[PDB]
Each structure stands twice: as structure tokens, then as C-alpha cells.
Ligand binder design. Structure first.
Ligand SMILES: NC(=O)C1=CN([C@@H]2O[C@H](COP(=O)(O)OP(=O)(O)OC[C@H]3O[C@@H](n4cnc5c(N)ncnc54)[C@H](OP(=O)(O)O)[C@@H]3O)[C@@H](O)[C@H]2O)C=CC1
Ligand code: SF4
Ligand code: SF4
Ligand SMILES: [Zn+2]
Lengths: 176, 208, 126, 123, 96, 95, 114, 292
């Protein structure tokens, strides 16, 4: 099935040729184009005003790279290094240490935000949902040093909101 | 089986085996291997002295049009007498069939630059000259494409490493961009991912 | 067209344009990566790896990362034989040190040898 | 009125969903399109930075951040409590461009631990 | 909506498009977010008692390539694939 | 809570706090060395270790797919509490 | 190893083509150093040209000598056009030191080096 | 020396050298090219500024990832200077405005600024504090500039006597001042001998002085080997140029002299090759319309 276009001879009727000559002299469908421009002129614009009327989003949006901790508990990460194994730009830098009691935990947890490409493979691979893609997007930095994060930065970034992330996961846990 | 396994074809496999046997008979001068895999796309594998004859015969002879070209690639493999593999990949307009035309070569011996029968291969040949080093005799212009001007090395080799030997930064001492030996800021921690326990038993070469 | 042959090596060592310290000083090592003993199985054998000597990795002064001045640190050239390994090393230019391939010697073992009336192999727990 | 006449443009108060601590105001309408359901009015000097002018994003608390980016349909005054106690209740807001912002440092102890020269001398 | 009828008449007068009907202001046609959560089932598997991985192991059936000629009175000359017959004209308004 | 180094500043929860002649201190000039004052070990001390009447018990962490996979711990020795590897909270038995 | 040739059947046309290349580079310097508005005398650029020819004294095979002539002819094309720039020609020069040493004593103090 | 202060690897771009530099000034010319060579060397540069942050953003792309760092001070306080010199391995003093502002005279900048900073530098236990000075800074008359720099030399020799005083001649470079005034034309006949010195040999001598000991105490000089007349230099600069807030302390400086002192070592004794003014003058003699 094909539908090939631009095949006509010009119809040489007197009425057809005087309509096309009037189109040549008066620029008629040019005025029809002006009519379309007025028809969009007399609408109302679908803009948003930026600080006061924010644009919509999705529940599965991937921003801040925060960390969760347990319900009335401590750090949800184990340092199991699956997020480094799936992080494609190798932005995850993890050097673990077991803590002062014996249970396996971290020392050096680094998300190189200059290298992160915002997939969610660390969101998929994380077997306890410790690392979570955050909701918001204001990094917006006047320096380079403040882009690269550390463990206490990410945990302060996860202590600024939890029920945000818990609400998004409770919306999204059946699908992913 | 009936779901979740991609079903194989039969009669198309038969016709491509017949056509490969046809080509292999009617060109005794440049034929080493013809093979069909499970997904039924024909492969011909060729000594590098009849490249323009095979492409002229596979453009015409009227039971094989194959008017569309793809990719040329001389895919780099070590360990061999002939590393580089020119891989033509041809599609026909009247037929709906796919052939791969793989001829082999080493690091220095040129081939005859088949731009004169397929005009598409001009920038392809210039690009694979810039990236590999397979020199192309009887060719109008070999410039460098997809590389820097002052850079060289043919960097798609397995000898040229992932990061380069060159680095660029700016200085205001001489008010311009200068080159340096490379200084990575991270290790590129290479992941050992070679599993044991015989990943595919059907592809066992005879052990030495 | 049947040009002359000569008993020489190949000289791409100035065609590839790698700098001279990385040409000469990188003493290569050809080795068989043997069986990872914490695993089991020699599937990862049969592939001669040409790799290079390691150099320094210093502390990144902001993060403690291992910043290196090495292009030739992460290469791994996968071969099938030893003669072609020597041929590639003479072809591209550098020198090298060679390990052998040390296959497991097969030993006679039997459960009927694990048990005996007058030999001193006695599991005493199975 | 000069407040909202030179705040940005609007006059569209008339739905009155509510407010939140830092005083900020949140208004949800259904009469407009999807994109101007929920709008926000920022107060003045919420943390002493004179935020009548030069208003920032993320001067909002995060429950209204989820409500206002069109991820839910009901305000966070529908479900007030949550039984988690570790969270910030100060809300150090967006801060890139202050003398109070992040600096990076590797949470890593000493690596090789050089030999100690002896205390007492000799000879 | 929320417009006077004179400018609506001007919008129809500018072009015959009936701009009041579909207007690029999605009001309530979007489904109301945070529905009750729907379940995600599993298809032709996860029933017990039969589903061997020995049966449906299409990954381990990748065959080695089959070969013909190498270095190691015929009523013939077929095509690689049958000549597909020329297509059909359009039903709904081709030119012509 | 934060401790007191001889630099007069906030130490870290893992022992990386600076020496008195580190110039990383003098690249921390005039800005916040940020720290999470909530520490991980400070919450385990306020955990009521529960008393389950079985022998080998389960742990999920408050609902499947919100937490950690099913781990099964043992309550044999009465001299040691049964510590989860994921939860970081103990368990005991009575009889 | 009865290899196909490239341009030359022996070393004679190899030396002839590389001396023609060096002829072209000698008559190629003043036009480019007057056009590109550099900071360097004509004689210094010509001496780096003859130095870069002096670097490759150990090249023997006719394929390799012809391939060096091919690289030099391609670069002379890209410098008789202004496809390249001032940055590339000053990258042929090595002026921004990099004073990196060679003495074993200075490979020893500034060390971790062969 | 503390750990992670020791040198590492090949030079430049995370080569944590044995210096931690604290530079005063550097918003202008010579200190900016000095920070340029330090970022080429790859150390951490602590630099303060009281100016608009444009020039410190301008010197941001110099060092590696987060190496250089910026702060603030003024010619009133002590706390900010102490905060700059809290933990500094090496420290250098470039300062001086060549005209009189309404609150900083030529007086009391060279008197009040190197005293406090060099005193708290000795009170911070630093090694190899370097301070600049002009050539022939004499107590002799007709030079407010040179006599205030001589008083600065006296103060720096008084407190922490083993500080490295560096005196070059006039400095021609890429953004020169006196050679710009030479080019700044549109009838006068005078003469005075003079020889200048090039900026990158000066700063290579600076870094050799800052990382090569046996250098302290004794002051160093850095003069190019020219030794000719002002009239030949005016003919030279106008033949290369192809043409037919300022005070007269400028014209006093360029009609003073350039005499030598054989008491102190110079370029070849410190070991850096001296370059004449020819092709660098061809560099810095632009702006002409169609002869290139
Ligand atoms: N050949 C020689 O030996 C000569 C040496 N010099 C010396 O070398 C250096 C560079 O030379 P030059 O080009 O003339 O000058 P510059 O403009 O390069 O450097 C002068 C510096 O002094 C700073 N400064 C001066 N007064 C104050 C103040 N009150 N508060 C804060 N900062 C102040 C300036 O800061 P900012 O610009 O931000 O206000 C600037 O960073 C100077 O120290 C100068 O004394 C100068 C001339 C000749
Ligand atoms: S995948 Fe999750 S649990 Fe594992 S190391 Fe990464 S953050 Fe920790
Ligand atoms: S989102 Fe992607 S790039 Fe970013 S940390 Fe996760 S895996 Fe890495
Ligand atoms: Zn658990």
C-alpha cells in the first residue's frame, strides 16, 4: 500500500484558471495564512509563570540522588557495590569498612554528579532501596567542588525529606 | 518453545544456502567460505584480490541486484596473520535478502578501494583509513575524518588505550590551547567479568 | 606483483605514534591467567593475556582517588597461542617476559582407593 | 495590592487551599488548565533573606513540593502525621552562593600510617 | 472556555477550524492521579509442576554456523529470496 | 552527637577527623564542614529487642518490597542476641 | 612474505619521494608562517621540520617509508589549506614546558620513575 | 613534612608537589602568571582578593579539580591575613598600586602591608617567604616608588631576616604596562640607559627560588642581558609597531637608570635560560592595522 503525491495536470477550465489568476493577483491564500495567524493570536497562551506556577512532573522522576534510612533506624545501605557494578559512567565510588560493631557498612560513598547520567540502574540494582533517585532538581552551583557528593552530604540530603521519597516509592513499588 | 523462543525459518534458510552454494560454484577464483547462521543471513568470506570483481558481480548478473551498501568495517582482531576484516553488508531492492561480504587483510597490504562501483563507500573508506590504517589504493582523497587534525594513531585499535596519549587544556602564558600527557582524575576501575563453568558447551574448539 | 621478501621484523612502532617512554620502558608480561582458586573451573584459561607493568597511582588531593599518569595500565590483549604473541610483540615494538602454561597433572583417585584393608587411607567419618 | 502587582502578575486569589509554616501560601484551582491548578505565594523574610524580592525555588517544604509538581491530588493537610523521628525540621534551604555551603572531603581514615620516630634520643 | 462570544466568533471567522471544540487547554480530561494501585500479574510461566528450564532454553540452542564451499545441464539459478510482487495503490485518496 | 577534636571542630562518625597540620583544614576556610549529627550507632541503643516465642524467626523490615529480603535468624544461644545482617536490630526468645 | 608494494619497488623511489616531501616542506614554511601570524622565525620552523625528518632514521621497509610520505603529504594538504590552525602548528612546537628530565639523579629525586 | 604533602607522579594536573602556596596580590599581572605556572606545577594556591570576583573567576580554569581557593582581606585588618596564613608551606608578597587612590597613598602600603603579613608569616613558622622589590630601590631622591620599596626591603629584612627578596628589572610580557605606555602615543628628546627582563624567565626563577634551597637570606636579581639605550629601544618599538590614572613618577622611572650590582647572583647562577626581547616584542607589539 503506497499513496504517492504531487501528480496533477492543472485543470484548464475557465473557472479554474480565473480562480487561480485571482489567487495570483490578490495573494488570496496568503491572506488565509494571515487569518490563521489571527486565529492563534486571539487564543490564550499555555505558559507557566516560573517560580509561582511550577510545571508538572511524574512519580518516577529522577533527581537529587538521596539516601533512605530505616523506619526508626540506621543507614539502609550495606555497601554491596551493585550500584558501582551497574553504574555505567563509574560515578559510584564505594570503599567499605565494617563499623565499630561488626556489621558491614561503608566509609567512602561517592556519587560523582558531574558523571551521573540519571538512568536508575542504581535504583534497580539496590537490593534494599537504599540509594533512591531524588525528586527535585536544584544543584545549580557556582562552584565545581559542591557538585561531587559524599556520605554525610547524601545523608543530610536524605534527612531533608523522607516522606517525599516514601510517597513516591509507595506509588511506584508495584511497577518497578 | 512455542512461546519465548524465537522461531527459525526453513525455506529462506534453504534458499540462502542454495544461493551461497550458487555463488561459490560460479566464482571458483575468490571463494574460501560461505556460511549461514541460525538467523539466516548469508555470509561470504573472501581472499583480498577480487574485491571489485565480487562487488561488480554482486551488483549485477540480474539474479542478484544488491544495490544497497553498508558499513565496510575492517573489524580488528589480534592473534592472526591477517588482523583486519573488511565487512561489506549488502541489501537488495527487488529481493529482500541480506548478504555479508567479509574479506580479510593485514596491517599494510592495501585493497583496491571499491568506491568506483559504490559511490557510498567514499566517506566510509576515508573514515576507516583514519581509524584503522587499511590503506586504499586507487582512491581520490584520503583525508582524516572523526579525528583531530594534529592527532594520529588510528585510535580504534586494541593498542591505543581507552584514554588517549593526548590531553588538551588552556594556558594564558601563550594565550592558547596546549597538549599534555594525559592525567586522569579517576582510575577507571576495570571489572573482571569472565565467568567459569562453560558458558556455552556447543562452541567448544578442539583443545590443544 | 611477487615483490621481494626479506628476513625482517615489522616496524609499526613509529607508525602508531605512541610516545617514546611508553614505547621502550613498558616491559610487557605475557601470562596465562590461571584458575581463580576461590572459584572452581578452568573456563577462564586458554587465553594468553598480554598485559603491561603497573606504575604509580597517587592520592587525588580532593577525594583520595587513584589518579594515574598511565595510558597503558588498563590494556589486556587476548591471544590464543604463544608464537603469535611473540610475533605481535616483535611487530609492535616492545619487550616482554613470558610465563609458561602449567596444566593440572592428573592423579589416580578412587573411592575404592579411599577404602582399604591394609593401606593407611582412612576417612573414618563417612 | 502592590505586593502582588509587583510580585509577578496575578490577581487570582479565590480558591484558598491553605498555607504552611514559613507562612507560604498554596492555592489549588480547577477552573484553569492543567499547569495552573496549584500556585504558590512566597512570603517575606522566611529565613531572614528578604525573600519578597529575589525569590528562590525550594523555599517550599517538601510535602508541598510533591503536591505542587502535580504528583498527587490532595494537599498534605489531608494526611498530617508520620511516625518517623530523624528528619530536619529547620529546612536549610537552597544555599549555593553563600559562605555556608557544601565542601567535599573523603570520609576515609589514614591509609599507610608512617613509622613513628622515637621520643627519646640516643648518644 | 472563559471567553467572550465575540472573540469566539472572530476565531471561527478567521478559519473554519471550530477552535472552541479542541483548544489546547487540558482541563479535566487527565485521569485523576493517585488511583487505587493496580496489580501486575505474570503470564506464560510461574505455574508449578511443568515449567522446566530444560524445555524453553532457547539461549542454549544457538547453533554453530553451517558451512558450504571453502578452501577446505543444470536447470538452476534461484534467487536468494522470492521476488516480492509490486505493491497496491492507496484506497483512501492517492494521487491519482 | 559531635565530639571535640583539638581543632575545636566537629569530628566525623568514622575516624577521618583532621590532624592539626592538615591544609585541607585551610581549604575548609569560611564554609560549613557539613556533618549529619544523627549517627547510626546512636539509634541501636534505644531499640527494644523483642521477645518472639519461636526458635528460628523471620525478618522483612515492615512489608515486602519496602525493606530487605527475608532473612532468617536463630535464637539458640542465650548469651548472644540474634542480630540481623540487614535490619541491624536484634531478637530474643522466651520460654 | 612476497608483499604487495605501495609506491616504490626498492629504496630508490622511497628516498626520492621523501626528498620531494622535504623539498615541499622547505618551500612550504614561509607562506604558512607569514599567513598564520606566528611568533617564531622561519629558520626555527625549518629546523623543526628537518628535526622531525631526523627522528625517523631507523625506518627501513619501503611500505613504511611510503606510508610516512603519505602521512606527510596528507599533513601538507591540511596545512596548505587552513583546515588546521595556529594551535596545531604550535602543537608541533613544544614550547610550554614540560622540562621533564632525563638524568638518573633527577629521575631519582623527582622519582617513582625509571 | 606531613603525609600527602610529599610529591607524586609526573608533573602537572594532580601532581601534589611539596609546596602549598599562598600568594598575595595576583589579581594583576605578575601574580596571575605566577599562579599560571603554579597550576602548571599542580599545587594548591590560596589567594585572597578584595576586588570584584571577575579576575578570580578568570584564574579559576588554571588549577586542577578544586585545587585553588579564594578568600578576602583588606589593608585594615589582621584576622583575615592570619586566616590566609593559617597553614601555608610557601608564601609570596606581591603588592602595590602604581597611582594614588583617595585612601591608599604610595606611603603606608609598602610600610604597613609587608610588616603585618611578614610578621604573621614568621609567627606562622613558614619557610621561604618571598617578597618582590623593584631594581635600584634607593633612599636617593626623585623616586617615591623606589624609596617606599626600599623601606619595604628594610622592614622585610628587619622582621624575619632570612626572607627571599627578589629584584628584577622592568618586565616585558603579554600585558605589560611600561611598554604599553611606550606604545601609547598620539615630540620629546631625552636619553637614559635601560635594560628589561622577560616575564616567564622571571617566574621560572621565582619557582626555582621557591623550591630550591640555599636561596634564603641573600636577595636575588633577575635582569635580561640587553644593556642598551632608551632611544634605540624607542626606535625598535616603533619600527616593530610601524608608526612614525597616570603620573610623572612613570617618566621618572623610565628616565632613572638600569645599573648592575655584582654582589648578588642572577640568572645563570640560579640556572634558567635568559631570552632576549625580539620575538616576545613581536608578540606584544600588536594593534597595528594591516602590516602583519
Ligand atoms: N620589574 C619589577 O620589578 C616591577 C615589579 N613590580 C611589582 O610586581 C607586582 C606586579 O606588578 P604590576 O603589574 O605593576 O602590578 P599588578 O597590577 O600586577 O599587581 C598589584 C597588586 O597589588 C594589589 N593591591 C595594591 N594595593 C592594594 C590594596 N590597598 N589592597 C589590596 N590589594 C592591593 C592589587 O589588587 P587589585 O588589582 O585587586 O586592586 C594587585 O593584585 C607588584 O607587586 C609590583 O610592586 C611592579 C612594577 C615593576
Ligand atoms: S546497591 Fe544499594 S545497598 Fe548496594 S552498595 Fe549501592 S547503595 Fe549500598
Ligand atoms: S543514575 Fe546511572 S549514572 Fe547516576 S549513579 Fe545511578 S547508575 Fe550511576
Ligand atoms: Zn532483617
Amino acid at each position: 500500500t503506497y499513496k504517492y503525491v504531487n501528480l496533477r495536470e492543472p485543470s484548464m477550465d475557465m473557472k479554474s484558471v480565473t480562480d487561480r489568476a485571482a489567487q495570483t493577483l490578490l495573494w488570496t491564500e496568503l491572506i488565509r495564512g494571515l487569518g490563521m495567524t489571527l486565529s492563534y493570536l486571539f487564543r490564550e497562551p499555555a505558559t507557566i509563570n516560573y517560580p509561582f506556577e511550577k510545571g508538572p512532573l511524574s512519580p518516577r522522576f529522577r533527581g537529587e540522588h538521596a539516601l533512605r534510612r530505616y523506619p526508626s533506624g540506621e543507614e539502609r545501605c550495606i555497601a554491596c557495590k551493585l550500584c558501582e557494578a551497574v553504574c555505567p559512567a563509574q560515578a559510584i565510588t564505594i570503599e567499605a569498612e565494617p563499623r565499630a560493631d561488626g556489621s558491614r557498612r561503608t566509609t567512602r560513598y561517592d556519587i560523582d554528579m558531574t558523571k551521573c547520567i540519571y538512568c536508575g540502574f542504581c535504583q534497580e540494582a539496590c537490593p534494599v532501596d537504599a540509594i533512591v533517585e531524588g525528586p527535585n532538581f536544584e544543584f545549580s552551583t557556582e562552584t565545581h567542588e559542591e557538585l561531587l557528593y559524599n556520605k554525610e552530604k547524601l545523608l543530610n540530603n536524605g534527612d531533608k525529606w523522607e516522606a517525599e521519597i516514601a510517597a513516591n516509592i509507595q506509588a511506584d513499588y508495584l511497577y518497578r | 518453545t512455542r512461546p519465548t523462543v524465537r522461531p527459525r525459518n526453513d525455506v529462506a534458510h534453504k534458499q540462502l544456502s542454495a544461493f551461497g552454494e550458487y555463488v561459490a560454484e560460479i566464482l571458483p577464483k575468490y571463494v574460501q567460505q560461505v556460511q549461514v547462521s541460525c538467523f539466516s543471513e548469508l555470509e561470504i568470506c573472501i581472499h583480498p584480490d577480487g574485491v571489485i570483481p565480487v562487488l561488480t558481480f554482486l551488483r549485477d548478473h540480474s539474479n542478484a541486484q544488491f544495490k544497497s551498501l553498508a558499513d565496510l568495517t575492517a573489524v580488528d582482531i589480534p592473534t592472526r596473520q591477517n588482523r583486519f576484516e573488511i565487512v561489506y553488508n549488502l541489501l537488495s531492492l527487488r529481493f529482500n535478502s541480506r548478504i555479508r561480504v567479509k574479506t580479510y587483510t593485514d596491517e599494510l597490504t592495501p585493497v583496491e578501494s571499491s568506491v568506483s562501483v559504490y559511490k557510498a563507500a567514499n566517506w566510509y573508506e576515508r573514515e576507516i583509513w583514519d581509524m584503522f590504517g587499511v590503506f586504499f589504493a586507487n582512491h581520490p582523497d584520503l583525508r582524516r575524518i572523526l579525528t583531530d587534525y594534529g592527532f594520529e594513531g588510528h585510535p580504534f585499535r586494541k593498542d591505543f588505550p581507552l584514554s588517549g596519549y593526548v590531553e588538551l587544556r588552556y594556558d594564558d602564558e601563550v594565550k592558547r590551547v596546549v597538549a599534555e600527557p594525559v592525567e586522569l582524575a579517576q582510575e577507571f576501575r576495570k571489572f573482571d567479568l569472565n565467568s567459569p563453568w562453560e558458558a556455552f558447551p556447543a562452541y567448544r574448539q578442539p583443545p590443544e | 606483483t611477487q615483490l621481494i621478501t626479506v628476513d625482517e621484523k615489522l616496524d609499526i612502532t613509529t607508525l602508531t605514534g605512541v610516545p617514546e617512554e611508553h614505547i621502550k620502558t613498558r616491559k610487557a608480561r605475557i601470562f596465562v591467567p590461571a584458575r581463580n582458586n576461590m572459584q572452581s573451573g578452568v573456563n577462564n584459561t586458554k587465553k594468553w593475556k598480554m598485559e603491561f607493568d603497573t606504575r604509580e597511582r597517587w592520592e587525588n588531593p580532593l577525594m583520595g582517588w587513584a589518579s594515574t599518569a598511565d595510558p597503558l595500565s588498563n590494556l589486556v590483549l587476548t591471544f590464543s597461542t604463544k608464537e603469535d604473541a611473540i610475533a605481535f610483540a616483535e611487530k609492535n615494538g616492545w619487550s616482554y617476559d613470558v610465563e609458561e602454561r602449567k596444566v593440572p597433572k592428573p592423579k589416580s583417585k578412587s573411592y575404592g582407593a579411599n577404602f582399604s584393608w591394609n593401606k593407611r587411607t582412612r576417612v573414618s567419618t563417612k | 495590592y502592590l505586593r502582588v502587582l509587583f510580585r509577578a502578575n496575578d490577581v487570582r486569589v479565590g480558591t484558598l487551599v491553605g498555607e504552611d509554616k514559613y507562612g507560604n501560601k498554596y492555592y489549588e484551582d480547577n477552573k484553569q488548565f492543567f499547569g495552573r491548578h496549584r500556585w504558590v505565594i512566597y512570603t517575606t523574610e522566611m529565613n531572614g533573606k528578604n525573600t519578597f524580592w529575589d525569590v528562590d525555588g525550594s523555599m517550599v517544604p517538601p510535602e508541598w513540593h510533591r503536591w505542587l509538581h502535580c504528583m498527587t491530588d490532595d494537599p498534605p493537610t489531608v494526611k498530617p502525621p508520620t511516625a518517623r523521628k530523624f528528619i530536619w525540621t529547620n529546612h536549610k534551604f537552597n544555599l549555593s552562593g553563600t559562605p555556608q555551603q557544601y565542601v567535599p572531603y573523603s570520609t576515609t581514615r589514614k591509609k599507610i600510617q608512617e613509622w613513628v620516630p622515637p621520643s627519646t634520643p640516643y648518644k | 472556555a472563559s471567553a467572550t462570544r465575540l472573540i469566539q466568533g472572530l476565531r471561527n471567522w478567521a478559519s473554519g477550524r471550530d477552535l472552541q471544540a479542541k483548544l489546547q487547554l487540558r482541563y479535566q480530561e487527565i485521569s485523576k492521579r493517585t488511583q487505587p494501585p493496580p496489580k501486575l500479574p505474570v503470564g506464560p510461566s510461574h505455574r508449578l509442576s511443568n515449567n522446566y528450564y530444560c524445555a524453553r532454553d532457547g539461549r542454549r540452542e544457538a547453533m554453530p554456523p553451517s558451512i558450504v564451499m571453502s578452501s577446505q545441464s543444470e536447470k538452476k539459478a534461484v534467487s536468494p529470496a522470492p521476488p516480492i510482487k509490486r505493491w497496491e495503490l492507496s484506497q483512501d485518496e492517492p494521487y491519482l | 552527637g559531635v565530639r571535640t577534636s583539638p581543632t575545636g571542630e566537629k569530628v566525623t562518625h568514622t575516624g577521618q577527623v583532621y590532624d592539626d597540620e592538615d591544609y585541607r583544614r585551610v581549604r575548609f576556610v569560611g564554609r560549613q564542614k557539613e556533618v549529619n549529627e544523627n549517627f547510626a550507632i546512636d539509634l541501636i541503643a534505644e531499640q527494644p529487642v523483642s521477645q518472639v516465642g519461636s526458635r528460628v524467626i523471620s525478618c522483612d523490615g515492615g512489608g515486602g518490597a519496602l525493606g530487605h529480603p527475608r532473612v532468617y535468624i536463630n535464637l539458640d544461644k542465650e548469651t548472644k542476641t540474634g542480630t540481623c545482617g540487614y535490619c541491624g536490630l536484634q531478637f530474643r526468645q522466651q520460654h | 612474505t612476497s608483499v604487495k608494494p605501495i609506491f616504490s619497488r626498492d629504496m630508490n623511489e622511497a628516498k626520492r619521494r621523501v626528498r620531494e616531501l622535504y623539498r615541499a616542506w622547505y618551500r612550504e614554511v614561509p607562506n604558512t608562517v607569514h599567513l598564520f601570524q606566528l611568533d617564531i622565525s622561519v629558520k626555527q620552523g625549518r629546523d623543526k621540520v628537518r628535526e622531525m625528518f631526523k627522528k625517523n632514521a631507523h625506518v627501513t621497509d619501503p611500505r613504511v617509508v611510503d606510508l610516512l610520505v603519505i602521512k606527510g603529504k596528507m599533513e601538507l594538504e591540511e596545512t596548505i589549506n587552513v583546515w588546521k590552525q595556529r594551535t596545531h602548528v604550535m602543537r608541533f612546537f613544544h614550547e610550554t614546558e614540560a622540562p621533564r628530565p632525563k638524568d638518573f639523579l633527577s629521575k631519582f629525586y623527582v622519582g617513582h620513575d625509571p | 613534612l606531613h603525609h600527602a604533602v610529599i610529591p607524586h607522579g609526573k608533573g602537572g594536573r594532580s601532581s601534589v608537589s611539596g609546596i602549598v602556596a599562598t600568594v598575595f596580590g595576583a589579581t594583576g599581572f605578575l601574580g596571575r602568571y605566577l599562579v599560571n605556572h603554579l597550576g602548571r606545577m599542580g599545587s594548591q594556591v590560596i589567594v585572597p582578593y578584595r576586588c570584584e570576583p571577575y579576575d578570580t573567576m578568570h584564574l579559576r580554569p588554571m588549577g586542577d579539580l578544586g585545587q585553588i581557593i579564594f578568600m578576602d582581606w583588606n589593608g585594615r585588618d589582621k584576622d583575615s591575613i592570619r586566616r590566609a596564613v593559617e597553614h601555608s608551606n610557601v608564601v609570596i608578597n606581591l603588592v602595590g598600586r602604581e597611582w594614588e587612590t583617595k585612601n591608599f597613598d604610595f606611603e603606608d602600603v609598602f610600610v604597613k602591608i609587608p610588616q603585618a603579613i611578614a610578621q604573621v608569616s614568621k609567627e606562622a613558622g613558614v619557610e621561604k617567604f618571598i617578597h618582590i622589590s623593584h631594581l635600584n630601590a634607593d633612599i636617593k631622591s626623585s623616586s617615591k616608588y623606589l624609596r617606599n620599596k626600599a623601606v619595604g626591603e628594610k622592614e622585610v629584612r628587619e622582621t624575619f631576616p632570612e626572607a627571599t627578596i627578589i629584584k628584577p628589572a622592568d618586565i616585558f610580557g603579554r600585558e605589560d604596562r611600561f611598554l604599553n605606555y611606550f606604545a601609547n602615543i598620539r615630540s620629546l628628546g631625552k636619553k637614559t640607559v635601560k635594560q628589561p627582563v622577560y616575564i616567564v624567565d622571571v617566574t621560572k626563577g621565582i619557582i626555582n627560588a621557591i623550591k630550591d634551597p640555599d636561596a634564603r637570606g641573600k636577595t636575588f636579581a633577575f635582569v635580561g642581558p640587553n644593556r642598551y639605550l632608551l632611544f634605540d629601544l624607542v626606535q625598535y618599538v616603533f619600527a616593530v609597531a610601524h608608526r612614525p590614572w597616570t603620573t610623572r613618577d612613570k617618566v621618572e622611572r623610565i628616565h632613572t637608570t638600569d645599573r648592575t650590582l655584582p654582589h648578588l647572583p642572577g640568572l645563570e647562577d640560579l640556572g634558567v635560560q635568559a631570552t632576549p626581547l625580539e620575538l616576545k616584542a613581536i608578540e606584544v607589539l600588536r594593534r597595528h592595522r594591516t602590516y602583519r
